[PDB]
Amino acid sequence: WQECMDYAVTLARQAGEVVCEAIKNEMNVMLKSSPVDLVTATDQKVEKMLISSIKEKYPSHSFIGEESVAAGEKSILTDNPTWIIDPIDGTTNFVHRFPFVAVSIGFAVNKKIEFGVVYSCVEGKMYTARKGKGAFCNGQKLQVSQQEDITKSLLVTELGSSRTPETVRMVLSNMEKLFCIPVHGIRSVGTAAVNMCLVATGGADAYYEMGIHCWDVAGAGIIVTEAGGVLMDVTGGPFDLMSRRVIAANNRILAERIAKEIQVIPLQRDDE
Amino acid sequence: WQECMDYAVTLARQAGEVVCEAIKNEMNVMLKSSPVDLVTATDQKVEKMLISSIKEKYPSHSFIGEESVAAGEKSILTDNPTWIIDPIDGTTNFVHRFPFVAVSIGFAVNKKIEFGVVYSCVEGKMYTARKGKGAFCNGQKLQVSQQEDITKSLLVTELGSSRTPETVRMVLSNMEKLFCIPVHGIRSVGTAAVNMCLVATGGADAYYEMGIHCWDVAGAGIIVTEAGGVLMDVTGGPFDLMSRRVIAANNRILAERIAKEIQVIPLQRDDE
Ligand SMILES: O=P([O-])([O-])O[C@@H]1[C@H](O)[C@H](O)[C@@H](O)[C@H](O)[C@H]1O
């Protein structure tokens, strides 16, 4: 899979070049599932580039992509080598020129992530990780923080793409519970993949969200764990990539403390 | 004042060097008024260095600084040339190595801000501005966004340092109102000066917060206005540097719409 990975890092650098030239030009901003769920022409054409470049070399592999699944294809994960692709994680940031947009590629065999690449192009930062070989940012090795005490922790989360009132209400009240423990603070940079990579560097101690998609987090998940962190469902159980919930933490102590405090928000799975 | 300014830029880059070597090393962390109100040896060290060098060169000038005030200096603003200094804005980020920390210097004469320097040392971004002469980042001219429609805007704000339940429930309540207009999103980078600087660049459309201090915002206020933005109190009235409250928006239409939406929290002034 090293060949696939070497190939992947090359693709991510290229698509990141496109995404970051587009960010300064005029854009066509269209609507997906609501007025706050967006897509531009660049999400679509970059996803097209990536899928056809991989298909060419690796014609037997399967794909799950955001804009593809939007175009009507289904998000069903099988045992076959599967590329899980977000062409632009942080599309609302992209549209606004808010300087955090990522290109994310995860690679799963036997329904398990083998390697991931997250390219944050505006910063010029390449995150990579392969199962068992560690996580790197631009060739330097990453490690999560050592904090085990929640009252001294710094968390990252997002408010989400939903504006359903009840949903919004549960999101804000889940925050209030954590904030009032108290923790040291909460941040949001606008993208799940980059939020997770900040955990891997040890910048933040933990990340949680409910409402993400499998393509948003498949690349960054293996980077956290190869950096020494942990992935967990919000029940405290094992991470389920298609479930739309994730806790990514420096360790199990903080991870279990967050699962304890927050309430579960009902969502449809990616595989439903 | 251009000499003071050229001086200011040199000081802020120097101190940014101190800050950004320190961030790599272990700190002993100290509390001030609460468990989440933090201070380190570097905050104190850097402020001391900064005040010494200025008053070496500018003996008649006054100073307002965060840690000075913590040592019992008072935050009364006169018409005298005054340097308003925050050695590290983002001390909680600093303690965590969350990669957004700034040195901030504003310079007021007749109790109006003449120039402002904000050095975000981890990114190597120097934001500067002088009344009537424009705003720049590393020699590149800044301009705020053109957004006049709140439903298509991206906001930045901070959850704040209070953990008083009543305050927190109002902070989140004000978030809910805005989120549900709806806006495109809300972000928090962890420092007021950098948040405001992202409004200046056009990355975000508006920033608001209640609970900040004069030193948090004295540098970045003129960077926003010289990029073409407006400052305004959350009440709708004019910006008061000592009031603990601020809206920094791209234009008057957004500033006034946000004020309409949110409710004011009672705060103790900086000059009381
Ligand atoms: O839509 P997208 O920009 O590709 O990805 C979204 C971003 O990561 C956002 O920050 C997060 O809150 C959402 O859950 C994601 O779906």
Ligand SMILES: O=P([O-])([O-])O[C@@H]1[C@H](O)[C@H](O)[C@@H](O)[C@H](O)[C@H]1O
């Ligand atoms: O204490 P400090 O870190 O120097 O400054 C603080 C930061 O800018 C924070 O983002 C903001 O929410 C607080 O209101 C400020 O006081």
Ligand SMILES: [Gd]
């Ligand atoms: Gd996306």
Ligand SMILES: [Gd]
């Ligand atoms: Gd500070």
